[PDB]
Amino acid sequence: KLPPFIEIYRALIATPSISATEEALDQSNADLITLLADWFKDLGFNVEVQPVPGTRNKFNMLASTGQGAGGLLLAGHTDTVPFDDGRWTRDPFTLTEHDGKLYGLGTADMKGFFAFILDALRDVDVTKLKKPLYILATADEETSMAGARYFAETTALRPDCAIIGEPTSLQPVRAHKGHISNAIRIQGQSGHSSDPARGVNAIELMHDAIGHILQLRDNLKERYHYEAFTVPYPTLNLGHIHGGDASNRICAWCELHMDIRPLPGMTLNELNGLLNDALAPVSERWPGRLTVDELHPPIPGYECPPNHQLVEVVEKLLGAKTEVVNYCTEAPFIQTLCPTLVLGPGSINQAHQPDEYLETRFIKPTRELITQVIHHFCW
Amino acid sequence: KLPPFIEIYRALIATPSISATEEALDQSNADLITLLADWFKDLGFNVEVQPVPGTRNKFNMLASTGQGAGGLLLAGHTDTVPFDDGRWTRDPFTLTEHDGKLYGLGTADMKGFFAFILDALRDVDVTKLKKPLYILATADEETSMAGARYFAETTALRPDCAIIGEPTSLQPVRAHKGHISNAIRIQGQSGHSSDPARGVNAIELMHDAIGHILQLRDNLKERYHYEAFTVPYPTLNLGHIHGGDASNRICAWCELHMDIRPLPGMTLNELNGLLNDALAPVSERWPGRLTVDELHPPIPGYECPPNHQLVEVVEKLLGAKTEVVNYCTEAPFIQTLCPTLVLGPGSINQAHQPDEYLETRFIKPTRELITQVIHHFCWH
Ligand SMILES: [Cl-]
Ligand SMILES: [Zn+2]
Ligand SMILES: [Zn+2]
């Protein structure tokens, strides 16, 4: 009943699922979901399609089998980044073999993962599994991660563990930093530069705030360490500043946009705690003039405990040690449901690039890795 | 033979001469200058009309009677600011008497002055002056002051003294602060925020520069003093800042727009020296990254030596003590030729405002004052 691997792959690549914040480029993942939904139906899984609030008509799919607690969650995203038709030298939607490489938009990131899951399940009898098996297909990972966010917020599901099939060259990944973005906003009071003391100069107040923020930057860099990261400390970046009307007017308003990248172990609440603490002497001096607002929904840090049985099994199956990575995944939201690893075929060297491909040599190892992991946590 | 006072004033207000940095809005003062040049010719002045290099078809007028050293220079600008389409409740180019008030764009700043000079000169015999009388009418005071800058740069004229007819309510003004406006520009090096050490954050460098600038602000407030000014020290203001693309990118550029208002007697070279030395610690640590560009032609401070005959006689004519103002005039350029005073009818409260007027109560005092200064500085 299930087509062969390359045919499953071909149809997924041929179904456009580009995500974009730009209304013009943003395609519905409905056709991608229907493909996955009908195929998982055919294999005997129950299926739930979920509209995702505040997306342009995007959906999650959960495919479920078995009952009771625990089980394995296999998770991926159905969307791809846009393509540059100027730099692609093949049709992005045409799966093309050439020189041990399979070319197409989402070959590496990450439609291959679903083709491998279905391919691995082709002869498996879901009746005879001891523990539940879940397949999650999320919307809009490449933009808001609204799919994974809305799933982790609303789902009753509580698996024993989860693998998110992002391209890692089949290296298991157990952590990455978070990402919070803030606007620091300072209300001045206007006045003529003929008496620059008559008003409240927002730039002078922002100069004070920046002093305290750079002190926090130094404390973060000095007191929090995670040796496995290339940059082993939580980072703080001043990105943008704007304020004032003219050289000859008291600066009436000033705004600073910054980011912080918290290490896995530090929570969002403690980080907003550290930032309010740094700014406190300034907002106290000046009640009601300094506000801190979020620029973009925050992403928590993620880690999987390094001796978790998920990690030991995977490391042993692949004979590869776990890595940390310098990029954000859905793992922070899936980690609220159960211990989570990031592990998939193909490379971020092809992800989001023109003439994206997945090497065909990933085919046998990936089929075998998924088979072994389903037999380990469901049998 | 000259028309009456109200006719002269009517024509000057009826003749648009709005100046503007925007080429689109910048009207030629050619027709204003022509009215003036013919009226001074009719009274038997030698008149030169000079195109001002680098302006949009603008002219200076110098009207001359007599020859010899010294004499009195009476100066004013022919240009007005634009009118706001929303706010005027009558035609800015029609001189209308309402509430003992003469309404019109430039009634107060400062076309009235030219009417009062011509009116006063009706009853003067220029052949019996012992020292020359000069009237200068400048281009573009409200924008670049190119008129007065060019005149000061090029004229061989060295009058005994000069009065600029800016609106001061007929109070003698003897000094004002300068104005310099700079952009402090910092070139950083961008990169992803996942490693902030890979770049040079222009906001951090600008945080450094501002620290040094605020130290200069405090040095200026402390080490320099001129009692007559409400703010008796050179002021410094941080007016605008911008830089950088995104919260997740190292900030590659930052620009700060600031001004300084120096006291009379601080040169523009002294001030630029103080600002570059304040910024030296940042600029020496980050070679090639920090530049200082002028946003506006810089204006030196001005003062007239407070015991020149010009001040003593004008104070006595008016029964008024000299004042200082914060704002700028052409005085710093004119003062390079001769002791200069700023003295004119109409109020700085009408200048540049909708339904601009000059109160008629100023007509007699202003005519007497102009007559008297011509007698006192041209008969002796
Ligand atoms: Cl890393
Ligand atoms: Zn991905
Ligand atoms: Zn004026």
UniProtKB/Swiss-Prot annotation, chain A:
The active site is at D79, E141. Zn(2+) 2 binds at D109, E142, H352. One of its GO terms (biological process) is L-arginine biosynthetic process. Keywords: Amino-acid biosynthesis, Arginine biosynthesis, Cobalt, Cytoplasm, Hydrolase, Metal-binding, Zinc. GO terms for molecular function: acetylornithine deacetylase activity; zinc ion binding. It catalyses: N(2)-acetyl-L-ornithine + H2O = L-ornithine + acetate. Its cofactor is Zn(2+); Co(2+); glutathione. Its EC number is 3.5.1.16. It is found in: Cytoplasm. SUPFAM superfamilies: Bacterial exopeptidase dimerisation domain, Zn-dependent exopeptidases. Binds 2 Zn(2+) or Co(2+) ions per subunit. PROSITE patterns: ARGE_DAPE_CPG2_1 (PS00758), ARGE_DAPE_CPG2_2 (PS00759). Zn(2+) 1 binds at H77, D109, E166. One of its GO terms (cellular component) is cytoplasm. Pathway: Amino-acid biosynthesis; L-arginine biosynthesis; L-ornithine from N(2)-acetyl-L-ornithine (linear): step 1/1. Homodimer. HAMAP family: ArgE. Catalyzes the hydrolysis of the amide bond of N(2)-acetylated L-amino acids. Cleaves the acetyl group from N-acetyl-L-ornithine to form L-ornithine, an intermediate in L-arginine biosynthesis pathway, and a branchpoint in the synthesis of polyamines. Belongs to the peptidase M20A family. ArgE subfamily. This is Acetylornithine deacetylase. It comes from Escherichia coli O157:H7.
Swiss-Prot record, chain B:
GO terms for cellular component: cytoplasm. It catalyses: N(2)-acetyl-L-ornithine + H2O = L-ornithine + acetate. The keyword Zinc applies. Zn(2+) 2 binds at D109, E142, H352. PROSITE patterns: ARGE_DAPE_CPG2_1 (PS00758), ARGE_DAPE_CPG2_2 (PS00759). Zn(2+) 1 binds at H77, D109, E166. Its EC number is 3.5.1.16. Its cofactor is Zn(2+); Co(2+); glutathione. Pfam families: M20_dimer (PF07687), Peptidase_M20 (PF01546). GO terms for biological process: L-arginine biosynthetic process. One of its GO terms (molecular function) is zinc ion binding. Keywords: Amino-acid biosynthesis, Arginine biosynthesis, Cobalt, Cytoplasm, Hydrolase, Metal-binding, Zinc. Catalyzes the hydrolysis of the amide bond of N(2)-acetylated L-amino acids. Cleaves the acetyl group from N-acetyl-L-ornithine to form L-ornithine, an intermediate in L-arginine biosynthesis pathway, and a branchpoint in the synthesis of polyamines. Homodimer. This is Acetylornithine deacetylase.
